[PDB]
Amino acid sequence: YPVKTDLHCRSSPSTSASIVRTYSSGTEVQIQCQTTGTSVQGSNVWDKTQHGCYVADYYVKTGHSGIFTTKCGGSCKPPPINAATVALIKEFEGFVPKPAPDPIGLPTVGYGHLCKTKGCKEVPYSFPLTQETATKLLQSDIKTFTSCVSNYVKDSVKLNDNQYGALASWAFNVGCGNVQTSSLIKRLNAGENPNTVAAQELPKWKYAGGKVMPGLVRRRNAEVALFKKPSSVQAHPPKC
Ligand SMILES: [K+]
């Protein structure tokens, strides 16, 4: 069932409970079970979703007002990437304020955003982009990659925000399928010291067309330096 608005998914069926994640308008939810809690726009019905958190049923488009399924009788979103990670991706992707005017093939904008159309009008920000809107665009794009990193790395392997951000930057560059089959993920999951794994594995990802690319050597070195940058903030597994 689609949510009718940006809808908070809470740890209990209560507007006072902590927010586990927020579903954007139109996102599909599957209802495990329903319960009663805080009245929202005249309905006290709350739905437990596929993520194990609770949403106000008023904002889920089901065709029902009352409880219609099992009575009851979460999983934190990966965090946004930090400032240092954004700065690294901007260094290596550059900044493009507007799409090339009449492009051959699909253009880029912002910080390495590949457009789906030549006009790129499906991007939800006005052209030209500013540093602010390029960053928001990047935070949206990077969700694919923080999601797959956080999926493939075991939850017993704690990564700080710099480590997580470095992997997100790598993943964005190489794609999730490559992350999944990487020795990097394998060695992290075997319990090897993360900084050692990163330092040894990331520099291997330097080849294009059988040829070592200086730009990739440079990027992997910057990703290694970010990975090893000390932090006491845990990013993986997510906390909420
Ligand atoms: K995981």
Side-chain angles (χ1 to χ4, degrees), residues 1-70 72-97 99-120 122-240:
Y1 302 112
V3 306
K4 311 191 201 206
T5 192
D6 293 351
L7 189 58
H8 295 314
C9 197
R10 298 189 182 257
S11 60
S12 289
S14 167
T15 56
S16 298
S18 64
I19 300 172
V20 169
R21 64 203 292 127
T22 299
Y23 295 116
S24 62
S25 188
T27 302
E28 286 284 345
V29 295
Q30 300 85 229
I31 299 169
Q32 296 189 51
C33 62
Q34 294 182 293
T35 196
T36 61
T38 307
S39 182
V40 177
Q41 300 300 321
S43 171
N44 73 348
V45 179
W46 289 71
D47 303 333
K48 184 187 276 191
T49 72
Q50 67 271 25
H51 297 107
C53 49
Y54 299 90
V55 294
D57 180 64
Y58 180 84
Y59 287 113
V60 183
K61 187 173 278 192
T62 69
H64 300 271
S65 310
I67 291 182
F68 69 97
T69 193
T70 300
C72 302
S75 41
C76 318
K77 192 88 184 173
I81 57 165
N82 68 12
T85 304
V86 168
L88 182 153
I89 293 165
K90 171 186 171 162
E91 168 61 26
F92 287 95
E93 298 301 346
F95 174 65
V96 176
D102 201 359
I104 299 283
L106 291 173
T108 61
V109 290
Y111 307 140
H113 179 88
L114 195 60
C115 305
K116 295 282 136 63
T117 66
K118 292 181 170 289
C120 197
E122 75 280 345
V123 163
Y125 309 103
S126 289
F127 298 125
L129 302 179
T130 62
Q131 296 314 305
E132 189 192 53
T133 58
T135 303
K136 293 189 217 297
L137 184 53
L138 174 61
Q139 293 283 8
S140 304
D141 288 349
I142 208 80
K143 287 176 161 165
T144 299
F145 301 101
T146 55
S147 175
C148 74
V149 169
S150 278
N151 183 29
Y152 301 135
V153 178
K154 284 182 175 153
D155 287 355
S156 57
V157 176
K158 310 313 181 188
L159 299 174
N160 71 49
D161 58 343
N162 295 327
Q163 297 175 320
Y164 162 96
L167 294 187
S169 172
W170 165 71
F172 177 58
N173 187 239
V174 307
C176 285
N178 281 329
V179 171
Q180 183 180 45
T181 54
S182 68
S183 310
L184 193 162
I185 291 303
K186 191 201 182 163
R187 291 173 61 181
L188 286 185
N189 289 346
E192 286 180 51
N193 180 52
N195 291 354
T196 303
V197 171
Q200 296 182 358
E201 292 292 331
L202 284 174
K204 295 176 182 177
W205 297 79
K206 62 179 171 187
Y207 282 95
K211 162 200 176 74
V212 179
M213 302 307 307
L216 293 185
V217 171
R218 190 174 78 104
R219 185 175 180 141
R220 302 290 91 102
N221 284 337
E223 288 166 347
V224 171
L226 176 59
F227 191 101
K228 290 172 80 141
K229 180 179 173 183
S231 167
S232 50
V233 172
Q234 176 177 312
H236 174 269
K239 332 205 70 192
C240 64

PDB file of all heavy atoms in Angstrom, residues 152-171:
ATOM      1  N   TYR A 152      25.805  -5.789   2.899  1.00  0.00           N
ATOM      2  CA  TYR A 152      26.805  -6.830   2.669  1.00  0.00           C
ATOM      3  C   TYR A 152      27.801  -6.979   3.824  1.00  0.00           C
ATOM      4  O   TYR A 152      28.327  -8.080   4.024  1.00  0.00           O
ATOM      5  CB  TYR A 152      27.554  -6.613   1.363  1.00  0.00           C
ATOM      6  CG  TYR A 152      26.659  -6.602   0.154  1.00  0.00           C
ATOM      7  CD1 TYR A 152      26.805  -5.633  -0.820  1.00  0.00           C
ATOM      8  CD2 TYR A 152      25.733  -7.609  -0.066  1.00  0.00           C
ATOM      9  CE1 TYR A 152      25.992  -5.627  -1.947  1.00  0.00           C
ATOM     10  CE2 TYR A 152      24.892  -7.600  -1.168  1.00  0.00           C
ATOM     11  CZ  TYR A 152      25.026  -6.597  -2.111  1.00  0.00           C
ATOM     12  OH  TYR A 152      24.260  -6.574  -3.233  1.00  0.00           O
ATOM     13  N   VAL A 153      28.054  -5.903   4.589  1.00  0.00           N
ATOM     14  CA  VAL A 153      28.950  -6.002   5.734  1.00  0.00           C
ATOM     15  C   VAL A 153      28.152  -6.573   6.903  1.00  0.00           C
ATOM     16  O   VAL A 153      27.159  -6.000   7.248  1.00  0.00           O
ATOM     17  CB  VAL A 153      29.564  -4.641   6.107  1.00  0.00           C
ATOM     18  CG1 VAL A 153      30.452  -4.765   7.343  1.00  0.00           C
ATOM     19  CG2 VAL A 153      30.354  -4.061   4.955  1.00  0.00           C
ATOM     20  N   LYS A 154      28.630  -7.630   7.573  1.00  0.00           N
ATOM     21  CA  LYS A 154      27.976  -8.198   8.740  1.00  0.00           C
ATOM     22  C   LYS A 154      27.754  -7.137   9.827  1.00  0.00           C
ATOM     23  O   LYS A 154      28.556  -6.233  10.012  1.00  0.00           O
ATOM     24  CB  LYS A 154      28.837  -9.318   9.333  1.00  0.00           C
ATOM     25  CG  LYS A 154      28.778 -10.604   8.542  1.00  0.00           C
ATOM     26  CD  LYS A 154      29.584 -11.726   9.146  1.00  0.00           C
ATOM     27  CE  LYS A 154      29.374 -13.020   8.376  1.00  0.00           C
ATOM     28  NZ  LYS A 154      30.546 -13.922   8.487  1.00  0.00           N
ATOM     29  N   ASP A 155      26.673  -7.289  10.595  1.00  0.00           N
ATOM     30  CA  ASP A 155      26.304  -6.303  11.599  1.00  0.00           C
ATOM     31  C   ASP A 155      27.251  -6.350  12.799  1.00  0.00           C
ATOM     32  O   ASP A 155      27.379  -5.332  13.486  1.00  0.00           O
ATOM     33  CB  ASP A 155      24.826  -6.436  11.980  1.00  0.00           C
ATOM     34  CG  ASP A 155      23.863  -5.938  10.900  1.00  0.00           C
ATOM     35  OD1 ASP A 155      24.304  -5.364   9.800  1.00  0.00           O
ATOM     36  OD2 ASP A 155      22.675  -6.158  11.122  1.00  0.00           O
ATOM     37  N   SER A 156      27.974  -7.468  12.993  1.00  0.00           N
ATOM     38  CA  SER A 156      29.018  -7.551  14.013  1.00  0.00           C
ATOM     39  C   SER A 156      30.294  -6.790  13.640  1.00  0.00           C
ATOM     40  O   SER A 156      31.185  -6.696  14.467  1.00  0.00           O
ATOM     41  CB  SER A 156      29.342  -8.990  14.314  1.00  0.00           C
ATOM     42  OG  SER A 156      29.733  -9.636  13.129  1.00  0.00           O
ATOM     43  N   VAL A 157      30.416  -6.295  12.396  1.00  0.00           N
ATOM     44  CA  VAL A 157      31.549  -5.490  11.964  1.00  0.00           C
ATOM     45  C   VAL A 157      31.182  -4.014  12.066  1.00  0.00           C
ATOM     46  O   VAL A 157      30.421  -3.498  11.259  1.00  0.00           O
ATOM     47  CB  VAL A 157      32.008  -5.857  10.541  1.00  0.00           C
ATOM     48  CG1 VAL A 157      33.126  -4.935  10.084  1.00  0.00           C
ATOM     49  CG2 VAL A 157      32.420  -7.325  10.462  1.00  0.00           C
ATOM     50  N   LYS A 158      31.701  -3.351  13.093  1.00  0.00           N
ATOM     51  CA  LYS A 158      31.342  -1.967  13.370  1.00  0.00           C
ATOM     52  C   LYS A 158      32.216  -1.088  12.486  1.00  0.00           C
ATOM     53  O   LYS A 158      33.406  -1.336  12.379  1.00  0.00           O
ATOM     54  CB  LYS A 158      31.578  -1.586  14.841  1.00  0.00           C
ATOM     55  CG  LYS A 158      30.988  -2.524  15.885  1.00  0.00           C
ATOM     56  CD  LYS A 158      29.553  -2.912  15.599  1.00  0.00           C
ATOM     57  CE  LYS A 158      28.989  -3.825  16.673  1.00  0.00           C
ATOM     58  NZ  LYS A 158      27.663  -4.349  16.272  1.00  0.00           N
ATOM     59  N   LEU A 159      31.608  -0.127  11.796  1.00  0.00           N
ATOM     60  CA  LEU A 159      32.346   0.828  10.996  1.00  0.00           C
ATOM     61  C   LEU A 159      31.982   2.212  11.502  1.00  0.00           C
ATOM     62  O   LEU A 159      30.798   2.487  11.735  1.00  0.00           O
ATOM     63  CB  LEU A 159      31.986   0.707   9.506  1.00  0.00           C
ATOM     64  CG  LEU A 159      32.279  -0.647   8.856  1.00  0.00           C
ATOM     65  CD1 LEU A 159      31.742  -0.688   7.440  1.00  0.00           C
ATOM     66  CD2 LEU A 159      33.780  -0.971   8.894  1.00  0.00           C
ATOM     67  N   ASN A 160      33.000   3.076  11.638  1.00  0.00           N
ATOM     68  CA  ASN A 160      32.745   4.478  11.959  1.00  0.00           C
ATOM     69  C   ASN A 160      32.282   5.216  10.695  1.00  0.00           C
ATOM     70  O   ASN A 160      32.249   4.672   9.580  1.00  0.00           O
ATOM     71  CB  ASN A 160      33.924   5.096  12.730  1.00  0.00           C
ATOM     72  CG  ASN A 160      35.159   5.313  11.872  1.00  0.00           C
ATOM     73  OD1 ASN A 160      35.058   5.874  10.789  1.00  0.00           O
ATOM     74  ND2 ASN A 160      36.323   4.887  12.355  1.00  0.00           N
ATOM     75  N   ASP A 161      31.875   6.465  10.875  1.00  0.00           N
ATOM     76  CA  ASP A 161      31.316   7.261   9.782  1.00  0.00           C
ATOM     77  C   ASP A 161      32.326   7.539   8.654  1.00  0.00           C
ATOM     78  O   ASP A 161      31.934   7.662   7.509  1.00  0.00           O
ATOM     79  CB  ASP A 161      30.671   8.559  10.262  1.00  0.00           C
ATOM     80  CG  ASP A 161      31.554   9.522  11.049  1.00  0.00           C
ATOM     81  OD1 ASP A 161      32.632   9.110  11.555  1.00  0.00           O
ATOM     82  OD2 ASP A 161      31.172  10.714  11.086  1.00  0.00           O
ATOM     83  N   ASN A 162      33.620   7.629   8.975  1.00  0.00           N
ATOM     84  CA  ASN A 162      34.659   7.817   7.972  1.00  0.00           C
ATOM     85  C   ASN A 162      34.881   6.536   7.165  1.00  0.00           C
ATOM     86  O   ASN A 162      35.017   6.612   5.942  1.00  0.00           O
ATOM     87  CB  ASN A 162      35.952   8.331   8.599  1.00  0.00           C
ATOM     88  CG  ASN A 162      35.792   9.712   9.187  1.00  0.00           C
ATOM     89  OD1 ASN A 162      35.029  10.528   8.666  1.00  0.00           O
ATOM     90  ND2 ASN A 162      36.487   9.950  10.283  1.00  0.00           N
ATOM     91  N   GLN A 163      34.938   5.389   7.854  1.00  0.00           N
ATOM     92  CA  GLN A 163      35.063   4.089   7.220  1.00  0.00           C
ATOM     93  C   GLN A 163      33.859   3.836   6.295  1.00  0.00           C
ATOM     94  O   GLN A 163      34.006   3.441   5.130  1.00  0.00           O
ATOM     95  CB  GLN A 163      35.204   3.026   8.308  1.00  0.00           C
ATOM     96  CG  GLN A 163      36.476   3.163   9.177  1.00  0.00           C
ATOM     97  CD  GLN A 163      36.527   2.165  10.308  1.00  0.00           C
ATOM     98  OE1 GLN A 163      35.499   1.910  10.930  1.00  0.00           O
ATOM     99  NE2 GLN A 163      37.713   1.634  10.627  1.00  0.00           N
ATOM    100  N   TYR A 164      32.653   4.068   6.833  1.00  0.00           N
ATOM    101  CA  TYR A 164      31.408   3.865   6.104  1.00  0.00           C
ATOM    102  C   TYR A 164      31.336   4.810   4.915  1.00  0.00           C
ATOM    103  O   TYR A 164      30.958   4.383   3.832  1.00  0.00           O
ATOM    104  CB  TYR A 164      30.252   4.001   7.080  1.00  0.00           C
ATOM    105  CG  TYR A 164      28.861   4.234   6.561  1.00  0.00           C
ATOM    106  CD1 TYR A 164      27.972   3.179   6.371  1.00  0.00           C
ATOM    107  CD2 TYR A 164      28.392   5.541   6.407  1.00  0.00           C
ATOM    108  CE1 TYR A 164      26.652   3.414   6.038  1.00  0.00           C
ATOM    109  CE2 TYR A 164      27.076   5.788   6.051  1.00  0.00           C
ATOM    110  CZ  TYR A 164      26.216   4.724   5.851  1.00  0.00           C
ATOM    111  OH  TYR A 164      24.905   5.046   5.531  1.00  0.00           O
ATOM    112  N   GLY A 165      31.712   6.078   5.119  1.00  0.00           N
ATOM    113  CA  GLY A 165      31.689   7.030   4.028  1.00  0.00           C
ATOM    114  C   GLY A 165      32.671   6.678   2.907  1.00  0.00           C
ATOM    115  O   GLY A 165      32.308   6.783   1.742  1.00  0.00           O
ATOM    116  N   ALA A 166      33.910   6.273   3.264  1.00  0.00           N
ATOM    117  CA  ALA A 166      34.903   5.813   2.308  1.00  0.00           C
ATOM    118  C   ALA A 166      34.345   4.652   1.480  1.00  0.00           C
ATOM    119  O   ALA A 166      34.455   4.664   0.248  1.00  0.00           O
ATOM    120  CB  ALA A 166      36.191   5.445   3.016  1.00  0.00           C
ATOM    121  N   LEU A 167      33.699   3.656   2.133  1.00  0.00           N
ATOM    122  CA  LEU A 167      33.124   2.551   1.391  1.00  0.00           C
ATOM    123  C   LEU A 167      31.960   3.017   0.510  1.00  0.00           C
ATOM    124  O   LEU A 167      31.757   2.479  -0.586  1.00  0.00           O
ATOM    125  CB  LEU A 167      32.707   1.443   2.349  1.00  0.00           C
ATOM    126  CG  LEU A 167      33.836   0.744   3.101  1.00  0.00           C
ATOM    127  CD1 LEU A 167      33.274  -0.438   3.884  1.00  0.00           C
ATOM    128  CD2 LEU A 167      34.973   0.282   2.196  1.00  0.00           C
ATOM    129  N   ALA A 168      31.160   3.974   0.989  1.00  0.00           N
ATOM    130  CA  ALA A 168      30.068   4.482   0.171  1.00  0.00           C
ATOM    131  C   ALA A 168      30.598   5.114  -1.126  1.00  0.00           C
ATOM    132  O   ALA A 168      30.016   4.934  -2.202  1.00  0.00           O
ATOM    133  CB  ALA A 168      29.221   5.435   0.987  1.00  0.00           C
ATOM    134  N   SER A 169      31.686   5.911  -1.023  1.00  0.00           N
ATOM    135  CA  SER A 169      32.337   6.551  -2.166  1.00  0.00           C
ATOM    136  C   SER A 169      32.864   5.507  -3.162  1.00  0.00           C
ATOM    137  O   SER A 169      32.586   5.576  -4.360  1.00  0.00           O
ATOM    138  CB  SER A 169      33.460   7.447  -1.745  1.00  0.00           C
ATOM    139  OG  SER A 169      34.162   7.892  -2.914  1.00  0.00           O
ATOM    140  N   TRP A 170      33.572   4.497  -2.638  1.00  0.00           N
ATOM    141  CA  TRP A 170      34.013   3.376  -3.461  1.00  0.00           C
ATOM    142  C   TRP A 170      32.850   2.677  -4.160  1.00  0.00           C
ATOM    143  O   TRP A 170      32.897   2.461  -5.382  1.00  0.00           O
ATOM    144  CB  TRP A 170      34.833   2.438  -2.601  1.00  0.00           C
ATOM    145  CG  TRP A 170      35.093   1.078  -3.152  1.00  0.00           C
ATOM    146  CD1 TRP A 170      35.918   0.741  -4.186  1.00  0.00           C
ATOM    147  CD2 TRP A 170      34.585  -0.155  -2.616  1.00  0.00           C
ATOM    148  NE1 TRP A 170      35.986  -0.626  -4.297  1.00  0.00           N
ATOM    149  CE2 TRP A 170      35.164  -1.200  -3.363  1.00  0.00           C
ATOM    150  CE3 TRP A 170      33.753  -0.481  -1.537  1.00  0.00           C
ATOM    151  CZ2 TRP A 170      34.935  -2.535  -3.058  1.00  0.00           C
ATOM    152  CZ3 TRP A 170      33.536  -1.804  -1.227  1.00  0.00           C
ATOM    153  CH2 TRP A 170      34.093  -2.822  -2.007  1.00  0.00           C
ATOM    154  N   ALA A 171      31.819   2.332  -3.380  1.00  0.00           N
ATOM    155  CA  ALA A 171      30.660   1.616  -3.890  1.00  0.00           C
ATOM    156  C   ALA A 171      29.950   2.412  -4.994  1.00  0.00           C
ATOM    157  O   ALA A 171      29.505   1.867  -6.004  1.00  0.00           O
ATOM    158  CB  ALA A 171      29.706   1.288  -2.753  1.00  0.00           C
TER     159      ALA A 171
END
